[PDB]
Design a protein around this ligand. Sequence first.
Ligand SMILES: Nc1ncnc2c1ncn2[C@H]1C[C@H](O)[C@@H](COP(=O)(O)OP(=O)(O)OP(=O)(O)O)O1
Ligand SMILES: [Ca+2]
Length: 430
Amino acid sequence: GPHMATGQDRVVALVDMDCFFVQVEQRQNPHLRNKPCAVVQYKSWKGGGIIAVSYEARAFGVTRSMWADDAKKLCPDLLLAQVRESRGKANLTKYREASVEVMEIMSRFAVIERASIDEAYVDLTSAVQERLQKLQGQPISADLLPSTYIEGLPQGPTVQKEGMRKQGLFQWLDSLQIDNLTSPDLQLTVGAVIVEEMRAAIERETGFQCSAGISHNKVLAKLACGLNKPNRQTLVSHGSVPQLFSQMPIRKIRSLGGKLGASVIEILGIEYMGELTQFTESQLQSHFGEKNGSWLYAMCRGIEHDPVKPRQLPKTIGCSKNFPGKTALATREQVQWWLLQLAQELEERLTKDRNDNDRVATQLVVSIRVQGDKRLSSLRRCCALTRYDAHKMSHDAFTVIKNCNTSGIQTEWSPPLTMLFLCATKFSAS
DNA sequence: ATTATGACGCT
DNA sequence: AGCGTCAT
Ligand SMILES: Nc1ncnc2c1ncn2[C@H]1C[C@H](O)[C@@H](COP(=O)(O)OP(=O)(O)OP(=O)(O)O)O1
Ligand SMILES: [Ca+2]
């Protein structure tokens, strides 16, 4: 009752760029705009591997992970843009720089947590309070929410998509109590107004479109964001949760898309997030551990407390390359040459980072995969990163992994290496 | 023969 | 520390 938390204390948004690498390439090359297209890395093996796909191309069944030669079978007119190659490897700088463009715009509106290259969480609680003060009891017009969906609406006693969106929005606004500044539904609505403004600024100033979710916590904002893509935003209210979760597969909720989620389904014999409400907190803790159990108990009721962390920059800067099948590195010279290539890219990125962001990395992490090992990484070792110098970093990395070589012949490397990875970590202010 | 990333939890 | 999970 009066002491039961409802997790309605914050307004949190998640902004997620639409088909991001594709939009970066379409801005640069107008011939790719409004076309079925995809971004690919490398070209020699089966036309290259697809890593991003325009919505026009998705309509043909083109997906990430597909080889371009195969995507062409589904969509013969598919256009392609290739990721830059430097030092023998894919180089993602263009997309990292475009990400900074968007993150810097978002930061004007609120504190953001950079979740990935094209996603950021926004804590809008304070911005909403401020805006509510300006409004002064003034109602919110549907015109302020031109791309907003209200999940769950319309409901109760038009056959077109936009028509449905407006119908739901009208029902929501009709029911709002703008008289109460502490109303969580009103707070979410003002949050959505601000996110429309943020999304308009992103598009005006970069050309890029995005989707967004607005709710009371990160997990619901992330879920909301995916409900109406692309180029739309979705508000998930606390009250929408029981219906939304009643048919929502467990794997759709962030963090439950893997083994833990599979175990929840198997152990409890349930399919949907809402079904979790029938277990006590202690029951859930018994199966999934103290932390997970408490998290699940609250989450299935729409409640989550993970904060939006004030962090706009990545905490690590890494470079990696796979050497699949027959290309696995089998000589010491090979291993050394590629460590140098990786280290040269890393040096370039670190030097720019130090100049831009007033920080220096102090730890170098080296990871490798050996042929035969099913795991993505077979071994990881660290050493001090004391100088931004590619020859030094590559020599140091060789030193920490050189004893992994089984070969009795110094010149040969066995078992062959199928992945090299260098990562700079442990930043300190500079 | 997906590949190239990145954050965070466990022990 | 080094490994594993989950995710863009
Ligand atoms: N598995 C991956 N391997 C390499 N790059 C990836 C991978 N997943 C995502 N990316 C890159 C390319 C994407 O354009 C970018 C953002 O990813 P993501 O948000 O999952 O999809 P997207 O932005 O391409 O489409 P959507 O419109 O569905 O969000 O990150
Ligand atoms: Ca995206």
